[PDB]
Symmetry: C5
Subunit: 376 residues, 5 copies
């Protein structure tokens, strides 16, 4: 994740132009290697045509250069790339939306599961840990960064996501599929036990806990789906052949011919095909957006920070269910205790953002006395 | 936010043409500086070509002017800008949709949390204040206007969003991440305490309160997500290079050459490239839509009024949970108490809007007696 | 709202061609004035060129006519108009989807709030009236037709939407923002009072009532949002300049020159630029779709019938909660009381629509005996 | 509804080519009449030009044929048709999604409403019948097929959807709007009565019943909305004029001129304008998709089978709430009662579909011993 | 399903280029037969023109070759294919999203339905089996792979999805429609019986069970809808005629003529029409994406693995409700029992993914002392 939200807060002079001076997550980082290969091939062909070929061979190469230059437009690269990248970006944001957060669940576990004694602490910690464990099991199944951090269940044990007892239980339950679903069943059974043991006072609170946990389950299932059901390989191959064929053709059709023949469109021989390179930049960068985003759980600069999310979820969830359980700030009358229309102040830097309320678009309509009178 | 909803209520003669006479939130305000730089560069190049260059240098410049003018169309600016701005507008409206409003929560807190005594008042005020505090913590994390208004937690204390006790508690809980989630945990624990203390009469009402509060939490999480997960920097750089390369090329390809040579398409030498300027207006304004909307929590004219929303939420929520708690208008028989078919009157200005009911599209189908008869 | 659903039920010969003979909500009604101005300007320019200008001035005008005619295509009107109108149509249908209907709420109020005495009647009527009042307050804030019908809160009192007591209470609560939210708080507190007074038998029914009411609140909030957050004025100005610049250019580039010069594409001098007029019809009508739909609560022919919806909601909701409360048709054995497979008859006009059930796409797959046998 | 799902299960050789040999729901059925009119007009113009016109008149007709042929491309038919048909297809699938099914409701009514006696049977049948009656009232309001089957409420009585008592009650309640909402109010009041009479044991079950019923109400409201709020007539007229103007122009611009003059692009005189006819097929068929789908409740081949859905809903719902109420198959130990890893067999035809489980995309990542070691 | 998620984790050099070396689910596999037919026809026409035709016949064929070559662009294949394939891909992902998973339901059944005795085991197994049976009945109705595995209800009995008693009960209930809905009614009635028998302790838990089961019902209904309501056959025929007409025209317009005549664009006679073949690859592969995805439950390589999902659902659901019922790992203090800020370790391979928390986009805004001061 490369965040530049602060740099584009306002539409200032050359707002997006300042972003062209970024390297991490940059288009340069993504397609400099492909561009170097393309440039090498282009100039190898240029030197072959300019030095090796004979007069008749050079004429036959020139005829093919103008034949290829007329079909470079026959390729509908823009359409294919436009639909495919839109599909990849949609899937990318859905995959983010299906990253599980324990915040709703941890608030309900902190509130509903009672007891300041060791048993209450252990019960709350175990429930939240089940939620975190389910999340990490799916994430290590779908995220290469998380897998590299936890290449085995024993690593999850050493890192504190799973106890040795939980590891043994998981081994006992092993089926020939992903076992990421197990902690949800454990959670449901432990919540039932807590309710029967009086730690959850009412079954409506148990229903709320199970609802939040099942929401997390659905998110983890969606992550499994996106990891398993790739964008059809045929659609990916179609877009790839469009881009590569376009630039393979450009490798010949965009050669600078001998100006002597004075072919139409070859009057002046510049050495660098600047607009060909700009088209490469545009089309290959647009494809590289898909190439980076198609699996957003990899290790690209703009891929999701799954490891950070795992660490932050564990810390936050344990703190909320253990230290913050029935641990509230003192409840005292606030600053506006007897102020009917509170008006919090503005700093000198923010005074310009004070606004009158928008009352609705009809507020300033003017009508005559006769217009406003009800009719029988 | 520049509201013009009232001006476009009806499709009147030149409805959208009257909007070209607006300055605030206008396209002129957004790209006058870039346009001035472009115009300066265009005329500097014009004077260089017309005065400095020699006959042969002028001919070589003219050859490049017609070479560049033929590739200005090779750029697929329309496609790149069309997909990117659609993505930015989608994200912009989602970000609005994820601005938290306490209205549902404050109705449930006003109704469910009982007691006209000081303790009931304090409990209701504290719960609603927790909701407002969570909202303001995330908003100051994502909105430059709100941050400038509350550059520190001490400012939140001085403005009445947070008590000194709440500030101390937040400091005690500090982790190396955003603490905007804390007030939700506080809310859940305080609602549990209110239920156990008899201020909430049934656990179904507590479930309702926690559901509304968790909805606000999810909205605040979405705001955090949009602030953190920028549109991929590669996609932004691709669109930026498309626009800038197009107009850099136009800076040469759209020069007015000497009419003497009588080049095709250069017959008449106008001094102002009116259609080039219109293309600049169109493409750069379309890009400036993205530049303004990509971070809708900045300080642009059309950015969201986060400060107003904060103030209005605090005022409304405190009034609803404190002054309006069990404070109802007298319940008396209405104007249509014994009128089976109430028909509220129309003013002379509104009589034209009285309509017969639409009964469905099948209402006027005509069938014969034999057509309408059931068959055995 | 111009409904033509019945005319397009079937794909008949020239189904959409018969719709070109409609005036109300027609494209003619929307852009006849603009077209008359355009036609007047076009022929004024034609007469100026044909009569006033000298030979050399006419030649200079002709050179500019063919210069302008070559850039009329440089304008990407189709793209700009295509994205903007799609955004406007999406917002238009969302705004419809957020029009509040009391039907769910009124069924729950009719069922749950008990008592055939005057107090039960008054309680049910007051709750449904709160829902209607919230709806009308937001609608008069966002709809010019509703505002013209209720230009003041006193008009709401005279029309029976609000009692004098409710009006006084609203004045007492006045804040410098829209007060459309107040009736929801009133509803929540009155429902709580009804539950505590035994008129609502269980708190689960109170939860259901509050859920439906909060759904209506969310819809009203969405209406407020769409009224307040206009489509960015920059995007509207961009599309407007695209259309107007295109046709300003056409005003010169589409002039019929003197055939004598025999310019390419000016061989025959027709007096009416039929295809220019068709382009005007197309592009300006496509823009007029946005101009009419951008604020669907105005007074255009195809704008929503907010007044009708208000009247119909009041009538229906009062009837459901008052006259239909525990007022059921006699419950008796039906026509198929002992008929295992009911087959309601068809008329002679409908016999053709009787179909066999679709059993699924796999139903007709044929397999051999050996193919169908399970393997160990 | 023309189902071809079975024919396109696999991407076989010429999968979509075999579908060109279908008549029902075919493009031929939809635009053969328009095509015959177009062909007649084209050849009438051909014979007029070839026989009636004089040499000078023929030359003036030829000049107009090449003038019209150059603007046939000026029409942006593809854009207009592409956005409009996408809107129509979106609305078409939403309208399907809002067809009410009693399956959720009938399961809850079968389970929750108790009693094997005549009163329990009558209560369950009456509740499900209310749901079916609401559905049929809206469907006969919006569907021409259903209206033709039930052209009056008396037909609903004769067909068993409504009892004479229900008909009398509906007449007593008559307001000047669609009364499709009434059965929901009846349902809510009858469910309340059943709860108070002990036939529904807990108010949570009553909440579930009312939730499902209100979901059906919302679907029926959406159907009413789509029937009432047509796609703006202006947008429909714009697309219609685009298509018709294009082909009116083609009627002249696509005439085969005399080869003698040897005009560019008229070298060889074929009698049939094959590509003009293919363009007619394409554009008019794309428009006919909208013409058929714009009202999917008509009587086109691909319109929804509303009558079948009505019949199937009545049969299924009555069977589920009456015959299947507490009528369960014997509960006995299953085939895998003591088999920890059940493996249901495969037939010889399905053995090829047995797969190993996908374990996640990270499963095959290989790391060294040192890479896998945790760091302090 | 061909998963390549692991290969595209990172945007590496030629990431998508390595995918062109895949056969299963490849574009080659999908359109090699059509391409062979096209190539055969192209070269048959080439040999006919080059050998059979006389001088005048060859000239007439050449005139038609350049006439056809000018209309190959008149076809708007890109637009038609672009909208249709987007619709097919949307439907494809919705169909995946509506594949039922028992995970939520099985967690609730494992937790809520009590008893370690044989009766509790049998009740839990029977409920989960009802859910699985409903899923398999719909899947065998819509999936050719599942139908081939279970070509009769007797096969479902032999495979253990249905008992002989359940089969007899289904036969007794037979109506002339799909009976996939029956197991939901059975589930609701059996859950009611379990609640009345004390196996479900509270009706809120029964409400939760029925909610999850009804969610599965809605998913199965959506699957039935997508199987029944095909994409309109007219839209499919339109796209098919676009592609086939384009390439039929190319069969003549893309012939290599005799270079002797030196026609424009036919200067050099290459034997293989490389760009025609690339266009075939592009357009026909883009169509083959739709052809494979239009019914994603077939037996294509990229079709869903319905059989695997069926097997995995049965195994997982039975294990969760039977072996894991109240079978929890020992609850013991975790690794961070008294560690306020848990920091799970990183491996040497993952150390690079450790990040500082993102605190929000406003975090680094700098303001002066005077700027930060509140104003009165
Ligand atoms: C192409 C871009 C070049 C840059 C623009 C040229 C400079 C335009 C004049 C300076 C801006 C107006 C002054 C201002 O600061 O204005 C504030 C005021 C309130 O803003 P409001 O009217 O939105 O409310 O606005 C008003 O005086 C009333 C609004 C009048 C604005 C009309 C501008 C249309 C023509 C510009 C293109 C030439
Ligand atoms: C290109 C734009 C130029 C402006 C239009 C030219 C003026 C057209 C005639 C004046 C409008 C009709 C008069 C009217 O006020 O009409 C009301 C009436 C009810 O409206 P309704 O029919 O929608 O129901 O309509 C009717 O008389 C029946 C409907 C007949 C309208 C047919 C117009 C098609 C041709 C126009 C283009 C030339
Ligand atoms: C370009 C448009 C001009 C109008 C069309 C020309 C007239 C085509 C023949 C008349 C229609 C078929 C007769 C019919 O009423 O058919 C019913 C039958 C059932 O319908 P079903 O096969 O969908 O099941 O269909 C069948 O006989 C089997 C289906 C055979 C239809 C093949 C038509 C493809 C070629 C047409 C273009 C030339
Ligand atoms: Ca990646
Ligand atoms: Ca901004
Ligand atoms: Ca309007
Ligand atoms: Ca239809
Ligand atoms: Ca398939």
């Amino acid at each position: 994740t490369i965040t530049y939200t602060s740099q584009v807060a306002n539409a200032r002079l050359g707002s997006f132009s300042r972003l062209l001076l970024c390297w991490r997550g940059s288009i340069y980082k993504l397609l400099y290697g492909e561009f170097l290969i393309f440039l090498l091939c282009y100039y190898i062909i240029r030197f072959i045509y300019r030095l090796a070929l004979t007069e008749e061979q050079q004429l036959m190469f020139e005829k093919l250069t103008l034949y290829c230059d007329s079909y470079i437009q026959l390729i509908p690269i823009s359409f294919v790339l436009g639909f495919y990248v839109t599909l990849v970006v949609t899937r990318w944001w859905n995959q983010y939306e299906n990253l599980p957060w324990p915040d709703r669940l941890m608030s309900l576990v902190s509130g509903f599961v009672e007891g300041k004694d060791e048993q209450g602490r252990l019960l709350r910690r175990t429930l939240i840990r089940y939620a975190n464990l389910g999340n990490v099991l799916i994430l290590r199944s779908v995220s290469t960064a998380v897998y590299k951090r936890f290449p085995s269940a024993q690593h999850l044990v050493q890192a504190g996501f799973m106890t040795p007892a939980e590891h043994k239980q998981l081994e006992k339950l092993s089926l020939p599929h992903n076992m990421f679903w197990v902690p949800w069943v454990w959670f449901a059974n432990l919540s039932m036990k807590a309710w029967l043991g009086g730690r959850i006072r009412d079954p409506i609170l148990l229903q709320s806990l199970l609802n939040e946990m099942n929401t997390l389950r659905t998110q983890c299932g969606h992550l499994y789906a996106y990891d398993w059901i790739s964008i059809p390989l045929v659609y990916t191959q179609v877009v790839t052949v469009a881009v590569y064929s376009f630039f393979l053709t450009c490798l010949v059709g965009r050669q600078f011919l001998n100006p002597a023949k004075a072919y139409p469109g070859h009057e002046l021989d510049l050495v660098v095909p600047v607009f060909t390179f700009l088209q490469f930049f545009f089309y290959v960068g647009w494809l590289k957006v898909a190439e980076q985003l198609i699996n957003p759980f990899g290790e690209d600069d703009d891929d999701f920070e799954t490891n950070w999310i795992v660490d932050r979820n564990l810390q936050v969830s344990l703190l909320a269910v253990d230290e913050m359980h029935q641990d509230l700030p003192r409840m005292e009358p606030d600053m506006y205790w007897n102020k009917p229309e509170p008006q919090p102040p503005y700093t000198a830097a923010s005074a310009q953002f004070r606004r009158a309320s928008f009352m609705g678009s009809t507020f300033n309509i003017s009508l005559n006395k006769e217009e406003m009178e009800f009719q029988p």
